[PDB]
Structure 1
């Protein structure tokens, strides 16, 4: 099956339209390239901001709101009949420091006096509420799906000990969801989003957290499985089990940031796309074949599958593609093998079904067929 141009290959959203929407994460510069725009028009019916809807891009100083970049994404989505997801209202990263400073400009995490801690909790929760209110009041009629909180459970199975948590305890999660519902109404859908949702003890910790909150009347409609995964790991059986476990609680599932790295963890990457050997693309394509067969089987539990980019010329995975060089200056990709130095983030990953020159990959054929 040929490496033809994606711009006029059979539409990916159309193959899957009774199953689930098919989305892409974007940057605003992509809305001004002809190729990106035509790929979004051709192949996708859902969109998400890769960066410009994060807390620090929206409210970088208290009272200063930048919606110019977000607005452009919203406008392109509406003009082209796409669903929109909001990524994301609360995170422990790409968050502005001003949130966690007390009245005299000192870090709140440092405060020892207990009545002064409770004042900070309330102040931070008030700020959290205002940030959410302003965003939801603006977008509630345009944006149907919302990452309310991101990564709030650590990998050790305990609540992640972010400043949000150190300062305000578990109430920050509750206030985030309650605030989105109050200002957005009943028709927006509210998600908790995380990675390694398939992995113990995080999976069960995630599960117990959401069940508890739902029991307490905290509004949560679903789980966002980021799905930054590899060719082998995690297995499909464990994905399937994960999806089913959350669906048992009456939660929707979205696959919110799908990419299939060519590498392991910590990754040892090739320095260029051209160096990646052909067999890696065939392996990837069988992984995607199994993957999307599983998504289809569970289509009644999954409303959306979104890829964390458009085509292989641009992916955040390249920021993790460390290249390992042995003493002779040759590239080392075997995980236990000798090496002398590493150039962090200088290599090239290849995670999507569309290549860097916008032609279809074997993984595409594997997910467009009905075999």
Structure 2
């Protein structure tokens, strides 16, 4: 199993073309990087914007829409026959503050007057509809898959008490899906995206919510499982149980932001890519082998598997790769070991099947084969 250039390796999307599409999250500058471009054309047939289609990127100020960056990804996808996923119409992060300010410029969350609160709810819901309307009216014919809402369920099994819920309640979710369907039509597929969808009580709460919304006529086509996972968790058994229960509701499933971290949580990362022991790459590969075997077994319930990145030289996991140092200045990776200081987000993770030098990793061989 040679460490050959990925540009000379069997195409990943081709290996899985009858099971599900294979996607990657991208930043516009990568479309100007020869290697990244070659990777997208060679191995992927689905693309998503890592950041430029989030609320704050699209409408940073009410009335100021910036589709320039998003357009670059759409244009590239079209020129290369790739499906496109829109990430994301609604989220509590990377969302402009102006959405949640009242007519006097005060946080709607701070309103005590009931009358005033109902007014703010309807105001927020209007802004939500316009945001969604403008985006969907532009891209409805080019983008097939949409993360209509992202992370709206808390890890405590309750709805996430973000400004969206505090101000408008459960209705912000209903309005989001309805507006997307209204302006995009019956052909675009609408998804509720989240992480730790395999963990209780979140899993069942998400399950109950979509069950209830669907029963109320709210248009929801599938569930997006972010899948920011580790080498050992979640177990394949729980991943399977998760996919099955949502499939039972008539929902499509997409693995939307897959990365297999070399670490646990919170992460105790190595400071550089080269410091990561070769054994970790073998463990990671066995995980990828089991993971994709399961994805295939469940192919009639999964339409897409997207990696949150192209190759190891670029991954948001590095922002979470905290490096712990003991009193002697030595790196500490043992989860239950002494340490004196931590340098947050200064280390390096290696989550993909493609290395930082664009050569295939043990994990590539594990999922490209037929065993």
TM-score (norm 1): 1.00
Aligned with 2:275: secondary structure?
coil
Offset at residue 5 of structure 1 (A) = 0.2
> What is the alpha-carbon distance in structure 1 between the residues aligned to residue 96 and residue 350 of structure 2?
32
| 4+ residue runs over 2 A deviation | none
Aligned with 1:304: secondary structure?
strand
Offset at residue 52 of structure 1 (A) = 0.2
1:254 aligns with 2:254: yes
Deviations along 1:112-163, one digit per CA (max 9) or x if unpaired, are 0001000000000000000000000000000000000000000000000000
> What is the alpha-carbon distance in structure 2 between the residues aligned to residue 35 and residue 335 of structure 1?
36
> What is the alpha-carbon distance in structure 2 between the residues aligned to residue 196 and residue 348 of structure 1?
22
Aligned with 1:274: secondary structure?
helix
Offset at residue 94 of structure 1 (A) = 0.3
> What is the alpha-carbon distance in structure 2 between the residues aligned to residue 321 and residue 309 of structure 1?
16
Aligned with 2:84: secondary structure?
strand
Question: Would you say how many aligned residue pairs link Structure 1 and Structure 2?
Answer: 371
> What is the alpha-carbon distance in structure 2 between the residues aligned to residue 274 and residue 23 of structure 1?
27
Deviations along 1:278-329, one digit per CA (max 9) or x if unpaired, are 0000000000000000000000000000000000000000000000000000
Aligned with 1:75: secondary structure?
helix
Aligned with 2:292: secondary structure?
helix
> What is the alpha-carbon distance in structure 2 between the residues aligned to residue 65 and residue 127 of structure 1?
13
> What is the alpha-carbon distance in structure 1 between the residues aligned to residue 333 and residue 109 of structure 2?
41
Offset at residue 352 of structure 1 (A) = 0.1
> What is the alpha-carbon distance in structure 1 between the residues aligned to residue 61 and residue 8 of structure 2?
44
Match of 1:168 in 2: 168
Offset at residue 187 of structure 1 (A) = 0.2
Aligned with 1:346: secondary structure?
coil
Match of 2:30 in 1: 30
Unaligned runs of 5+ in 1: none
> What is the alpha-carbon distance in structure 2 between the residues aligned to residue 336 and residue 360 of structure 1?
32
Aligned with 2:108: secondary structure?
coil
> What is the alpha-carbon distance in structure 1 between the residues aligned to residue 33 and residue 113 of structure 2?
54
Match of 2:10 in 1: 10
> What is the alpha-carbon distance in structure 1 between the residues aligned to residue 370 and residue 16 of structure 2?
11
Offset at residue 167 of structure 1 (A) = 0.2
Offset at residue 8 of structure 1 (A) = 1.5
> What is the alpha-carbon distance in structure 2 between the residues aligned to residue 145 and residue 243 of structure 1?
18
Deviations along 1:179-202, one digit per CA (max 9) or x if unpaired, are 000000000000000000000000
> What is the alpha-carbon distance in structure 2 between the residues aligned to residue 182 and residue 335 of structure 1?
49
